[PDB]
């Protein structure tokens, strides 16, 4: 019965009409195919790469609704001229963050790069860069006559496009500076707090996601599945607002390298073990990352909030009906 | 009726049929997408923009079968460290071509730019940058895992150059062709015919004469583009003639275009006349002015044999113009 109540749950409130997720992405996608061709003419200057969609809508795996994904904006920087500080060699000493640093001033002068404009105390700030792409940023009435949509640009926030792609049907694009230095990709989203605002975010989630896809490929498995229930879980219950999807799919992966059996009858037990490991990470005070274990992935919450967590999931074990509710 | 042969012989000989336009386009298309995979994953510090499909396939200006297309490959160059010279401000005279000269040596070393290993004599030479390309990335490729993963057969072929196998009998040639674009100008690395001019770029006018076909005929729908197809067509089929461009017709087009303000499709027969007669002035005077562009002679390259061959075979045809339209 609980595999039963899991499978209700994800058809009634964890999964995405069909036809919304493929409308949905396919706007997405038709937008991204013409700033290509729009920022190509438009941007001589700017060492940038295509921007490039990226998010759980991308990938299939966006529960509830179909309304959010990024638009990657990949600079170019070049290896000489820069390098990547992980955060547990700063003085924040916070792993799962990075420094970018400008390298050899003396061997090539301020100015060598165009994203020295960008550059505060001697770092690439990613705040600086988010601020200078915006302000450089398009017709958008003419992109969406193009394609019938109506998009519309929010006021600040302004790196945010709001795509009325049918009638009642909206989705939300934010823009997403990026950088990579060798084999480390990081992403312009701040830590939660001012005093650490100076520092790129790794990103983890094209790993993540295609670990996760290539175990249930090779055994028809229900990773995906357990992922995504989770998710809807949290993203309908308040009190686990605080959790995010990256944390819920790395808690799968750690239980993925315990368990080789993740067959269709096997998600209740499955989620039983996902739920039971999120609150005993939830008690250490730490969730590391499956690719990379230095990283805290409860990093950015405070000792309260995750009391708060472990609380409102420890409670749910005798009251199913509001973590299953629809 | 010439009218009738014309008509007859775009939609017989110069229309591509609607399969084979779509499985080459869709051919360039996943090349282009899995190599701007590629750039992401294995060059991402590599000072280009992304490569982008360029030509007639990609504009419907290809005639009678999809056998050729463009990878742009554009160089991302510091605004402040290049510059670009006029090919007639130079002593080798040569309008339609460019320097790209290296700036502020003393102030920014040797090394600042990535693109400084490609200098040769203080100009960024076209040839050293295609060398480039082809080592660094070209060489990179592996062409067999692409070919097994789009599900073509893909072979290198004379340098920069792909043949892509889209169906049984036909294959679409890409060739990558660097790039740089200086404020408003871009140039493109398509040497000169002569040795000596080789370390010029060339002033790339496509863009902007098809720009400027597409508009005339969107405004009036004329047969502008039907009768630069219908000549384009004539020089693929028709050997002696082969050594027209599609620049140097379209550029006929867009001189009787200012002559003639009636292009209904009833004066279809009547402009390819006036263009043949065009034609033929401008290969006895030796110049074909580009529309855009008028210092520039679009027939410089031609040689005297050349020349002769397609003016005497296009005079012997005036008489009866119907021996072109097979």
């Known amino acids: 019965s609980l595999q039963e109540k899991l499978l209700s749950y994800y058809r009634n409130r964890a999964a995405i009409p069909a036809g919304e997720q493929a409308r949905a992405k396919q706007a997405a996608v038709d937008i991204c195919a013409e700033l290509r061709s729009f920022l190509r003419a438009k941007l001589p200057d700017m060492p940038l790469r295509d ?7 991308y990938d299939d795996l966006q529960v509830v609704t179909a309304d959010h994904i990024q638009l990657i904006v990949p600079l170019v ?7 990547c500080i992980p ?8 792993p799962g963050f990075f420094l970018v640093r400008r390298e050899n001033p ?3 002068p301020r100015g060598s790069s165009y994203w020295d404009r960008c550059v505060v105390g001697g770092y690439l700030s990613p705040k600086t860069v988010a601020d200078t792409f915006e302000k450089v940023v398009i017709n958008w009435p ?18 945010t496009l709001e795509v009325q792609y049918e009638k009642d049907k909206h989705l939300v694009i934010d823009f997403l500076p990026s ?3 060798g084999d480390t990709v990081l992403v312009a989203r701040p830590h939660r707090l001012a005093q650490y605002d100076n520092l790129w975010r790794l990103s983890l989630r094209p790993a993540e996601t295609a670990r996760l896809r290539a175990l249930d490929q090779a055994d028809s498995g229900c990773r995906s599945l357990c992922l995504k229930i989770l998710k809807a879980i949290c993203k309908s219950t308040p009190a686990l607002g605080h959790l995010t999807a990256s944390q819920l799919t790395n808690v799968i992966l750690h239980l993925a390298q315990e368990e080789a059996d993740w067959s269709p009858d096997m998600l209740a037990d499955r989620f039983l073990q996902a739920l039971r490991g999120l609150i005993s990470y939830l008690e250490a005070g730490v969730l590391p990352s499956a690719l990379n274990p230095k990283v805290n992935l409860f990093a950015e919450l ?3 909030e995750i009391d708060e967590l472990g609380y409102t999931l420890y409670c749910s074990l005798s009251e199913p009906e509001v973590l299953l509710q629809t």
């Open 179 to 181: 950088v990579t230095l």
């Open 302 to 304: 405070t000792p309260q």
């Open 77 to 83: 920087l070049e290896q000489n001229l820069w390098s």
């Open 87 to 94: 955060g547990e060699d700063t003085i924040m000493n916070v």
């Open 106 to 108: 003396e061997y090539f």
């Open 51 to 57: 921007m490039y969609l990226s998010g759980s809508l």
């Open 142 to 159: 003419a992109i969406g006559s193009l394609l019938d949509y109506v998009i519309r640009p929010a006021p600040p926030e302004a790196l």
